[PDB]
């Protein structure tokens, strides 16, 4: 039997999220020369952002968030933000044909040490009274849409920590403040941070990880039935 050697573990998000305990998993019992706590401590857990903050509205429903395992406290897998990505169904529906599509990539080094790319996509719109056939854009103006986005993310997310930066990427605080400043350059149908990835990490500090979870919600699977 293969489920005879499996132990159920529970995956906790950081303190940003409403549903802390998501995505119950398995792993082998320890044989003795290989421990479960080392096999688990690099895994990546994909979860929808609408299944975490417990407040949908079809802006959170179309983003999933990945978490990477840092520390193991018994049955809890203490994780940290790995990546966030707009789902592939929402992203392909945003393209229309006759407009134009700008794609910027900005490299951000947070004040904790996490280096990240953010991959912003933008789309032009026609005006309300516009009778034109296409509404494309000047390539002078898409390079200043791109210059202002690159300047504004490297300034807002280089002061902050990593718990604050994920709370900026979630909740659309960064994105809404990035539409409003980049709409007087070009008329924007949609500006959406498409995916963000943690690229490089600082060296593992244990006290900085436990601070990032608040109070751990105390799993129930080191148990009797």
């Amino acid at each position: 039997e293969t489920m005879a050697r499996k132990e159920w573990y529970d995956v906790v998000a950081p303190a940003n999220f409403e549903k802390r305990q998501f995505a119950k998993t398995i792993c082998n019992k320890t044989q003795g020369t290989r421990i479960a706590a080392d096999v688990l401590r690099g895994r990546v857990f994909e979860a929808n952002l609408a299944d975490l903050n417990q407040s949908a509205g079809e802006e959170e429903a179309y983003r999933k968030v990945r978490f990477t395992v840092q520390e193991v406290q018994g049955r809890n897998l203490l994780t940290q933000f790995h990546s966030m990505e707009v789902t592939t169904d929402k992203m392909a529906s945003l393209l229309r044909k006759w407009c134009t599509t700008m794609e910027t990539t900005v490299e951000v080094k947070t004040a904790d040490g996490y280096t990240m790319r953010l991959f912003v996509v933008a789309f032009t719109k026609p005006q309300a009274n516009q009778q034109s056939r296409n509404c494309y854009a000047k390539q002078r103006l898409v390079k200043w849409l791109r210059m202002r986005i690159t300047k504004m993310i490297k300034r807002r997310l280089s002061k902050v920590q990593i718990k604050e930066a994920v709370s900026l990427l979630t909740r659309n605080v960064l994105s809404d403040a990035l539409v409003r400043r980049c709409n007087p350059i070009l008329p924007l149908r949609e500006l959406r941070i498409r995916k963000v990835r943690v690229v490089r990490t600082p060296k593992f500090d244990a006290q900085a990880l436990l601070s990032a979870h608040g109070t751990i919600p105390a799993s129930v699977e080191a148990d009797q039935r």
């Binding site: 079809e58 429903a61 169904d89 529906s93 044909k97």
Partner: protein, 103 residues
């Protein structure tokens, strides 16, 4: 006998020299991107009989939260478009009809 002005493709005389080809969607034939007939399909994943079974067994999906779909942009060879009946041979007077949007 020039069968069609524009010669089958969206390139006029003094505009482009060439356009780099794409592979056909099922044949894999390399045809130029402006020549090859291109359809953007918005196909649903499940039939409405099959989707009703899945939406009923779903905590997420219902009449409020619609189910996703496939968005793939097919591009076909001209041999491949006739045979799959994406496109058909039309009468001589009827060939100049051009559709700017999906009907």
């Amino acid at each position: 006998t020039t069968k069609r002005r524009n010669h089958g493709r969206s390139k006029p005389a003094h505009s482009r020299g060439r356009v780099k080809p794409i592979h056909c969607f099922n044949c894999g034939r390399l045809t130029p991107k402006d020549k090859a007939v291109g359809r953007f399909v918005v196909r649903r994943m499940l039939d409405a009989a099959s989707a009703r079974d899945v939406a009923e067994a779903s905590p997420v999906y219902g009449a409020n939260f619609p189910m996703p779909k496939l968005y793939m942009k097919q591009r076909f060879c001209i041999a491949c478009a006739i045979h799959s009946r994406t496109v058909r041979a039309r009468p001589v007077g009827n060939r100049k009809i051009r559709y700017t949007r999906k009907v």
